[PDB]
Symmetry: D2
Subunit: 353 residues, 4 copies
């Protein structure tokens, strides 16, 4: 019921950066630079611009001081300058509020379009960006926990099929999803760049930003982040993991920044660039779907997420999911999960694993 525009979709290359509003810039800096080791592309007293080890565009993350912590923009790079015009015509046809700035919203981005998308998320589309030193061989700077690329976003929205069709029309291809036999969709993963995803939809009250994910080269780099957080006596900011995912097959960790923005560290998913890439559907009751090793998913992972802003910088009103809750059907009083389909041995009932 989000209508497909007659205007052609912009050609989206990949997720590129997120602008997060933070309440204490210095404490956010400590987390993203001193703990996590992201690289400074620019900073002043209002903003810090950060990039990953292998990036050549200006930044992957912008931290902006503001009164209420929230996602301000999730940005996708498009293939040509003309694609920003296409994005503008496309969202205007969808009836969405748009704002175009020929010189960008943040430093190091040129001509850019921000929109309040049909799911209430602040999307940005741009092509032009200031190139910086690509640090991919700067092993003199490489951290034991080095974050090497921006991998994806993950959005909480109440109606997953409705959002999925809209992103499919935008050219995103679904690689994996979670469903049940009654026909409810709980989550979907979709891509442009030929990894498992550039964004994903998690069923829940929204719009809220569930997480931003960075990749590492190897699994030991993720381990090191946990080990460092232990040494810094901030292990209470490790929310979930480390683990192996079922969906995506990636090794992963979820941690919480000082404003409780959730960051995923992620590595070693698989190639999805062929247009007939096989789509994998998991049953919501399969206890290996989210953590392959069957470790339980903490309730906060399902219930907590970041606010998102509209184009005026005000928090978007939240719409409550009416479809079945993944939390309730798996770990709630009436929920259940299995290790082996149809086997009570290794099943969990009204209880997590």
């Amino acid at each position: 019921e989000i209508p497909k525009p007659v205007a052609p979709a912009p050609d989206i290359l990949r997720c590129a950066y997120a602008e997060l509003v933070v309440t204490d810039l210095a404490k956010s800096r400590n987390f993203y630079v001193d703990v996590l080791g992201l690289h400074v592309s620019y900073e002043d007293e209002n903003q810090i611009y950060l990039r990953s080890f292998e990036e050549f565009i200006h930044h992957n993350l912008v931290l902006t001081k503001g009164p209420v912590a929230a996602l301000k923009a999730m940005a996708f790079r498009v293939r040509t300058p003309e694609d920003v015009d296409k994005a503008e015509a496309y969202y205007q046809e969808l009836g969405c509020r748009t704002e175009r700035r020929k010189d960008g919203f943040v430093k190091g981005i040129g001509d850019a379009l921000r929109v309040e998308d049909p799911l209430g998320f602040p999307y940005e589309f741009f092509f032009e960006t200031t190139h910086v030193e690509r640090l991919h061989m700067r092993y003199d700077l490489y951290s034991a926990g080095e974050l090497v690329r921006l991998d994806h976003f993950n959005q909480v929205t109440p109606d997953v099929p409705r959002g999925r069709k809209y992103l499919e029309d935008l050219g995103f291809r679904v690689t994996e999803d979670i469903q049940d036999d009654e026909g409810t969709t709980y989550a979907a993963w979709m891509h442009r760049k030929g990894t498992v995803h550039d964004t994903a939809l998690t069923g829940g009250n929204g719009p809220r930003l569930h997480h931003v994910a960075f990749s590492t080269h190897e699994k030991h780099n993720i381990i090191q982040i946990c080990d460092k957080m232990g040494a810094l006596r901030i292990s209470d900011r490790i929310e979930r993991g480390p683990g192996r995912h079922g969906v995506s097959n990636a090794f992963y960790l979820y941690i919480l920044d000082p404003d409780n923005h959730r960051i995923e560290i992620y590595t070693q998913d698989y190639y999805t660039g062929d247009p007939d890439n096989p789509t994998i559907t998991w049953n919501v009751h399969d206890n290996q779907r989210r953590d392959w090793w069957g470790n339980p998913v903490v309730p906060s992972w399902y219930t907590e997420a970041s606010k998102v802003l509209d184009l005026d910088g005000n928090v978007q009103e939240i719409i409550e999911r009416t479809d079945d809750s993944e939390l309730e059907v798996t770990i709630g009083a009436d929920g259940f999960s299995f290790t082996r389909a149809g086997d009570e041995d290794g099943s969990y009932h009204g209880q997590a694993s």
Copy 2:
């Protein structure tokens, strides 16, 4: 309370092997050989003798068919044949039951002494053992989850200070322990070979065997064991982990064999061979003591453990711990743990960490 003998202690080198009684030899073989990739030194219809990738002695694990799953013997190798005579005299002086066989209790071990020790555990001391092909460079056999050495045992016993003193007289050096501010000791780790431990004491009803631990080379080898168990749809046999330990600083995993015998996979602890190796004491309420990342310890890890047999093959009676329970004081209804000492933020009241 357990007196120090006048007789000299045997010079113990290291933990060497465990004999575990198992109820179904085929299912146990499938776990230890097919799932975990241990190497068969010998087998027949009653027993399977298994060794790790870098071992040269006959075995690190003997699976013996029997009617009740249990630990039958935890064996330590001693430095010389005369040390087996010393062990016998030492345990005689302690008034323990002993049994000595010049040709061994299990295949590939020679002159051996088994004892019912003062804590009710079946200990074996031996020197003589049949050498086998050391597979340490057999990369044609190397598994992505390869188990490379036997590292330690861990014993459940009701009174940790009492056991600790006895193990110290026997020559084990305590490297780390867990205590509280009220005089209670909850666990201790102690060594002969220059790693964090060869055995360890966990406070609880006992004697029971908490686990046997094998090492891997690298952390990714432990991750692969988890990944393989997922692919085999036996992830319900992963009990706890993977994680980083606080105590020992080792990367770890606990899994359960077909008879619920607990196996730890362990890697990358530190050198303890100097005699003034600094001893580390953790507070029982420190939520980074067991898992450094603050992940919760499932109650089964505290409550479940394997039976142990006496020298007649009968199960040892269980004596209940009267000291405070590590489970109850940390994750029970009146339990408590902290992330930072004295900080309410990141503390847990009456429940386990991580929500």
Copy 3:
């Protein structure tokens, strides 16, 4: 001098598979299945079809028994069935010999076009392929040296700029290259799928196939391949490495199969999918350009490569390189290389790095 056709280029997704002719199918099976752990999708007395751990198309490697070991086809998957028609019209405009088979040349591929390309290489274009079980979570099968994807081909050709221009018109984008200060190009890397490359051109007498490359997840997986070859006492089949590449930044190893076909194992290069991805040009005398740690490149790496076949199955005639030789200008008696540009300290004159001369 290869002109840009008026006909549209086919939309190529990625490299997909190679067909290698092998002389002893059993010995080749031992290497690829028993030593390297590739997964069999089909086999019989004549061919063995193999795939990597994360693949869903039918195969990444076909071993075909034949009298003369050679590359028979390097295959690229195209985006749609109609792109096979575009490939056909494109190479016909180029004046190249083509052959179309609606039911494929090898099992598990459908409608396919093979061509003798302007550099003399047998390229295949196809869309249709038989899907197989994607083994990406089959950790019960996973080996300590697991090969997880097909990454690229590497082609030996005498005139690199000529070939580079042709591949650019086909839609490949150059990511890295090696040149000198007086305008000679020694090598170029170029991509479709958003890694450093799907194919690459190495200056030398050609056409010859330099190597086929497979990926691993981690660097330790590459180390294990070496360790296993030592245990199997075939360490003489380790040609070069393991190392860190300069060009591509990937961890690597080169090994030789029973017919001397060269296989590279490769991991952890970077993303190139943005259309203004910065190109990187290295100086040929930079001793960190091929091995970042400065380890010497063995001369066989420069001189030895596989024969390639035409569409009749006959060996393509070799044409000699007339531009300067990378081997000669870096490690030959009149060559040189440097660690730091302009610094005599850490420079090597008339010999390779680390203290060896050429055998």
Copy 4:
């Protein structure tokens, strides 16, 4: 030829530290601290005291400014204060020169004995040492290339059996060695702490110090050291490696400090603490004995090593090896090596492996 004393040998725990004389303290600091990431326990204008990630004694490496770069002392820790007295009586009975300092030779060491041992090496024995913060869980400091322990020394001496017997009488057990079928020993490895070695003897002119070795946790840590040296454009200081050893089975790398002192990075050898630990003998012509993958050993590895000092601080005179040279018999012009014993295929005659010859 070196008699076993009647006096009892001191009980040696392990290698503990080396004192190296360096010519430019700031340049040496840049290598050991900025490049390699060792942790500073103390420094002033004359010395730098350094320790590894998991150490609790004061240091593993003392860098001492002086006019001539050299090993000044290889230090072993003993089990008790009374073992220092035993060391003094033991070496006095061997007829060696000894010097005892109740408050140490270097800061953070207490009562210490230095000796000119029968092979001309400056050994120190001590028990007392200042404990420092053990940084084994300080993951806030941990480097991608972190050196976690001091593992061993390696000594160049002309007569290996002569030195091996003396070290055996001192309590070291030989774990592996290299010999040929004609009675020559080329190298021996020997331990106290239950790893492959605490010291080792390499046949050549001596006394000279071949290297000091530090361990890492994982193989990727050694890879990162290489990668960092590339990024710092000091790849010319990577001498040999990275590799898998045959002898010791450890993953390894050799690098060269500013005064050319050789440092090995090392990981994942095996347990040797049992008294009947099987002793492994490799043949000197086995091309997998030093590098398991068959990579050639550069001539500098055989010919270059650090000077060692006597107790007066003067350089020890070098005695020439008369036994056969490992270089000459393996990679020399009349050399030979094999991949598979008894197989001509994969054998090397008068040259090194993998296409190289002596520079």
